[model samples]
Target: EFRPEMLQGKKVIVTGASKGIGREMAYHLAKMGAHVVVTARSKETLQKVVSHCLELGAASAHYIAGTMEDMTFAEQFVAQAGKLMGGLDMLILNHITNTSLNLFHDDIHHVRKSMEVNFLSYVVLTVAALPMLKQSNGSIVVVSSLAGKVAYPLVAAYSASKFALDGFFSSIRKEYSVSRVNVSITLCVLGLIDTETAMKAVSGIVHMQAAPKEECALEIIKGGALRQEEVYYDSSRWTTLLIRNPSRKILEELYSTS
Candidate 1:
């Protein structure tokens, strides 16, 4: 069984920690006694989050503010985090750039920027965090989505980047397993989380149900703390992965310019 204190005194870094699910996760980890380093694009928001972490009784808390779209920034952010935190026991990859709900055929630039922020930045940060993770036998928790596993309309760019994450991280997890690396890789497949931003984005057009952000945050934390290989925060999302082999369908749908 995994307890809140399982991460007591552990050092962890959480990207996208300024708001939404990432913010909630940072608060949860802090309450559990972990030292957390939070990162996001806004210095002001990150500062508030760090202060909240201290209020929640984190072993310690700090923030690094920058846009993850810059690979150089992504790399330096990880290195700097390790130095400030003194070490790292976990890396939570959760940053995503602003997404437009426009039809995929509308603009190629949207697709490119989505890939850069959602997928490539994650790769860059993970690579940069590897040395420190290896030294600590750490865990990497990727906050992915059902968008990565199922085909939903109106989010072609977002889905593509998420699918890429599923492919890259899952494959790397296998490779690490084959090599007997002590590091653990956990991928979190989430459903419609009821964040203010997500709900505001999909409001009238989409009637899909949403899970609570706090619950979603807790599940991600549980998986990372316990080193679970993959986690599904909602039953519907989990079923999407297990009910049928939808990988090909998902890939095809995401690649379409619908």
Candidate 2:
């Protein structure tokens, strides 16, 4: 049902494209006929991924290697990608610096750094891309996690970052809609994916069969291409909420003590 070259000739920037789902998404978007700009911290790794994207049929594939911890780089990266592509059609905020599965009461720097790389970088890129995106009536896809919606014991900082992304991006979505800005925001909630980093962290605790990174990546693309407000990756992750249509009050109460 979601078939469309809605992405044909589109210009897309995917942050954190070195490995895992970000790398996979860049590959798939290229294969689907999008001009892809991939970014990550390592120049060597990004070069390899860019080569793969070109081989996968990207109209044109390029890379900008830098750290998202530097907000200046984050902001400039979007403009650079847009300039390279000649116009911006989509922004995929997928890079994450912290994957700490630690207790909430640990050193506070964890939260600070997580906010920097996970949340603030997203805001910086979106704001920098806004003018170009507005001109093109483009879309933004945020890759969040199920932890953003419900609590998990050791993922405090990560969860908080995801929650912040939802609030900021979702608000931007409504703002644009109300003002007839014509931009779309698609928020994605993902479950366990068999990325090397994630799996090693959740080895004993998460026993459920993990989803493929390729599938997870494609879901994010589909969400953006279709301009969905939210896309839940697996049934076990959010199907109950879909059925209930529960109010925020109920969700708050339910998750507060769970």
Candidate 3:
């Protein structure tokens, strides 16, 4: 059984954690007595997050502020945060560039920015964290979205980056298996979470119900703790029925024979 000490004294890094579901995960890990290093572009907000993390019972709490748009900063932040807690036991690659609910309007800049911040930085962070994760047999929890799995209108740029994450991480997972690496990879697919930014973005563009950020955060942590390959969370009822793409799995199985 995976029922275990869970996160007591475990060192974790939460990116994009100044607010919303990211901060909620920090709170959950803090209550579980983990050592936490949280980051966002805004140091002022991260200051409050660290203070609250300590109050919520973290073994230790720290914050580093920088934008993930810079690949150099993303890689450096992981190394710096890892040193703070001696080493890292978990790396939560959970930052997304600011996006809005809108149709693709020939905006090349949005596409490039999303690729840099949403996708490439995650790769940068993961590459930095891998050595540490290997030593600890730890976890890399990539917080993704349902949009990564299937398409929807008005989210082309964001969806493209998320899909990039799925391909890169999923392929790496296979390589790690053959390399005999014990690091765990968990991809958490989330739907519309009812948070300030999410609500603001989708206010008029979408009418679907949204899931609670607190519970969404907890589900992701639980999935990573259990080392699940994938976790799906969406408030839409049809999501439950259609989330798993069995055809893809079948195709993969067929490919193995060739």
* CA lDDT of each prediction against the hidden true structure: 0.88, 0.86, 0.92
Task: Name the regions of candidate 2 deviating beyond 4 angstroms.
Answer: 235-245, 248-258
| Of 2 and 3, the candidate ranking higher by lDDT | 3
Q: Tell me each candidate's TM-score.
A: 0.91, 0.91, 0.96
For residue 19, model 1's alpha carbon misses the true position, in angstroms, by 0.7
Give one digit per residue, the lDDT tens place, for model 1 in 3-55. Answer: 88788999999999999999999999999999999999899999999999999
- What TM-score does model 3 achieve against the real structure? 0.96
Clashing pairs in 3: none
Q: How many residue pairs clash in each candidate?
A: 0, 0, 0
lDDT of 3 by residue, 46-165 (tens): 999999999999999999999998888988999899999999999998989999988899899999999999999999999999999999999999999999999999989999999999
lDDT of 3 at 101: 84
Rank list by lDDT: 3, 1, 2
Looking at model 2, residue 258 earns an lDDT score of: 67
Point out the higher-scoring one by lDDT: 1 or 3.
Answer: 3
